[PDB]
């Protein structure tokens, strides 16, 4: 996350931190995700498309730090890893950038609600907040585009929803943005998602409900003028989510 502030998992308790294990037991971060039910985390297919074997992945909930453990965290295996069979990416945009992970502890259990872990509601079909609405994104992604390191502490920031019309300008992304995507950015262009933030949540209040409006997917650079964040538009993937869940 460019800009924004350090937070803790208690302020984003639906945030899931997804890791890959290596032949030598080295564990590296992959991407973020969101807890949408006790056994299900939603994320982005592009995060997994190169190493699609569920066995390599670990998922943490209740976790506030990237390479250290935090009190109140819970560790899960991936029982099912479901990618979107129409995933594609031209050179910039990612289409159908959405994935599900069924999580299961070693005792065979799913998440339980606590101080650090809660589910995030999905929107009802085709229901997005109005443009101008202030939303939250969270992740362990880069703090600057040029960094080689990732912050150790969870961050969040606020961004505003942008109309397709406005996002579909030449000097933004044009028709590179489809109707199954959604743009958000800082009016002053100082805060944004970046590498490592993908799969993570874009959360808005909608009908007095904290709601998973988007999933961090793509964008040109990070916090670049006229280059908003581009998010999988969850309210247009309900059938896919019901049919796999």
């Amino acid at each position: 996350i460019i800009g924004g502030e350090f937070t803790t998992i208690e302020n984003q308790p639906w945030f899931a931190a997804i890791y890959r294990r290596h032949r030598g037991g080295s564990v590296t971060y992959v991407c973020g995700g969101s807890l949408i039910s006790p056994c299900w985390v939603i994320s982005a297919t592009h995060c997994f498309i190169d190493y699609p074997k569920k066995e390599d992945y670990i998922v943490y909930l209740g976790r506030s730090r990237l390479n250290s453990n935090t009190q109140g965290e819970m560790k899960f295996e991936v029982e099912n890893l479901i990618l979107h069979k129409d995933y594609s990416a031209d050179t910039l945009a990612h289409h159908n950038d959405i994935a599900l992970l069924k999580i299961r502890s070693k005792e065979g259990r799913c998440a339980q609600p606590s101080r650090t872990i809660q589910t995030i509601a999905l929107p009802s079909m085709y229901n997005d907040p109005q443009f101008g609405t202030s939303c939250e994104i969270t992740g362990f992604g880069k703090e600057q585009s040029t960094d080689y390191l990732y912050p150790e502490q969870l961050k969040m920031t606020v961004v505003k929803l942008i109309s397709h019309r406005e996002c579909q300008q030449p000097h933004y992304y044009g028709s590179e943005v489809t109707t199954k995507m959604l743009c958000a950015a800082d009016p002053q262009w100082k805060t944004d998602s970046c590498q490592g933030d993908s799969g993570g949540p874009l959360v808005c209040s909608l009908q007095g409900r904290m709601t998973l409006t988007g999933i961090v997917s793509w964008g040109r650079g990070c916090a670049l003028k006229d280059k908003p964040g581009v998010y999988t538009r969850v309210s247009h993937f309900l059938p896919w989510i019901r049919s796999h869940t």
């Binding site: 290596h22 080295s26 971060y29 995060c47 190493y51 992604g141 970046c194 590498q195 793509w218």
Partner: peptide, 17 residues
Amino acid sequence: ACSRYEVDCRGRXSACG
């Protein structure tokens, strides 16, 4: 170069492609 240890290797900001 960019490896299998790389975080979110197809994320915005990544050198892939």
